[PDB]
Amino acid sequence: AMAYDDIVSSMVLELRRGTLVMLVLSQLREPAYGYALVKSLADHGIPIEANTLYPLMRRLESQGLLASEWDNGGSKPRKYYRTTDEGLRVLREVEAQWHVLCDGVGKLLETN
Amino acid sequence: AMAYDDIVSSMVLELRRGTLVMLVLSQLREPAYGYALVKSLADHGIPIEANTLYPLMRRLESQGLLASEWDNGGSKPRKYYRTTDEGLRVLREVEAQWHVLCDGVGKLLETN
């Protein structure tokens, strides 16, 4: 009724979430402040809260997959982040498996 | 080292999880016992524990998206489940948005 719309939204939201790490690693192949990444994702049609995004980025930093740097610009300091050599390796692997997954899922859904 | 393999596995595992509800609704367009669905998914290359699968199916039942029936066959009773008219509606919507999502994600990853 509106319950059904709510069910659909949230199942679409789930699908989107799964893809975010990959999108973050991909974006941060160019060094960026978290705020910039936020607007960069929403600009490409992918909404993400700072409250989700920032913990995800630090967790990726703790994995060796992002590295970070402080910029002092008098406004305040802000970190920028960049995908490391290992992060790109991880990204490229996951992406290739994602594509296989998508074709496998597609075929299974098409059994008609 | 093996940490990296573990990071990759789990990011691939995440991607797979997102797709499961859709696969369950799709499979249960033919009535099936949970045990059958378990083996049916692992047969198509998608591993799922009964411990995850069964709560997901009841939650889908509580949404009006699966309905269920008891079979008494003397071994014991077992429920079978089937996708309802609303479930197929929900499935077909999510799937169409999933495809758009995949093409959007693909293009974003290919910016080179």
Side-chain angles (χ1 to χ4, degrees), chain A residues 1-3 5-112, chain B residues 1-3 5-112:
Chain A
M2 195 188 279
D5 307 17
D6 191 73
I7 289 151
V8 171
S9 271
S10 53
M11 297 178 181
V12 163
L13 152 84
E14 273 307 23
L15 295 157
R16 276 194 234 169
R17 322 247 269 160
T19 52
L20 182 52
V21 187
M22 267 195 311
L23 297 174
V24 167
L25 302 167
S26 192
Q27 195 56 54
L28 295 175
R29 295 147 65 202
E30 314 277 347
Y33 308 115
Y35 77 77
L37 182 37
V38 179
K39 175 80 169 268
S40 209
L41 288 160
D43 285 339
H44 295 80
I46 294 286
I48 178 51
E49 282 106 359
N51 292 350
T52 311
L53 191 61
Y54 290 13
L56 169 161
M57 301 168 72
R58 315 184 206 116
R59 172 179 193 96
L60 291 160
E61 176 173 9
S62 62
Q63 298 171 319
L65 312 186
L66 292 179
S68 68
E69 183 75 18
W70 285 102
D71 168 2
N72 265 257
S75 234
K76 42 180 221 181
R78 298 186 182 72
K79 286 168 140 147
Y80 56 96
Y81 288 83
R82 211 193 176 134
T83 303
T84 62
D85 295 308
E86 197 191 346
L88 191 76
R89 290 195 285 266
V90 163
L91 166 67
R92 298 283 165 253
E93 300 209 359
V94 180
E95 174 184 33
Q97 305 317 131
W98 171 75
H99 280 301
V100 170
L101 176 73
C102 283
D103 179 74
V105 184
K107 291 164 142 106
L108 186 40
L109 298 173
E110 291 155 14
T111 46
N112 291 283
Chain B
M2 195 188 279
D5 307 17
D6 191 73
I7 289 151
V8 171
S9 271
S10 53
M11 297 178 181
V12 163
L13 152 84
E14 273 307 23
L15 295 157
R16 276 194 234 169
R17 322 247 269 160
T19 52
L20 182 52
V21 187
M22 267 195 311
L23 297 174
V24 167
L25 302 167
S26 192
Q27 195 56 54
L28 295 175
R29 295 147 65 202
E30 314 277 347
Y33 308 115
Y35 77 77
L37 182 37
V38 179
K39 175 80 169 268
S40 209
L41 288 160
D43 285 339
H44 295 80
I46 294 286
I48 178 51
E49 282 106 359
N51 292 350
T52 311
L53 191 61
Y54 290 13
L56 169 161
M57 301 168 72
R58 315 184 206 116
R59 172 179 193 96
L60 291 160
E61 176 173 9
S62 62
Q63 298 171 319
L65 312 186
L66 292 179
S68 68
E69 183 75 18
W70 285 102
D71 168 2
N72 265 257
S75 234
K76 42 180 221 181
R78 298 186 182 72
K79 286 168 140 147
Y80 56 96
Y81 288 83
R82 211 193 176 134
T83 303
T84 62
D85 295 308
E86 197 191 346
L88 191 76
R89 290 195 285 266
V90 163
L91 166 67
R92 298 283 165 253
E93 300 209 359
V94 180
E95 174 184 33
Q97 305 317 131
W98 171 75
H99 280 301
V100 170
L101 176 73
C102 283
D103 179 74
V105 184
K107 291 164 142 106
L108 186 40
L109 298 173
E110 291 155 14
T111 46
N112 291 283

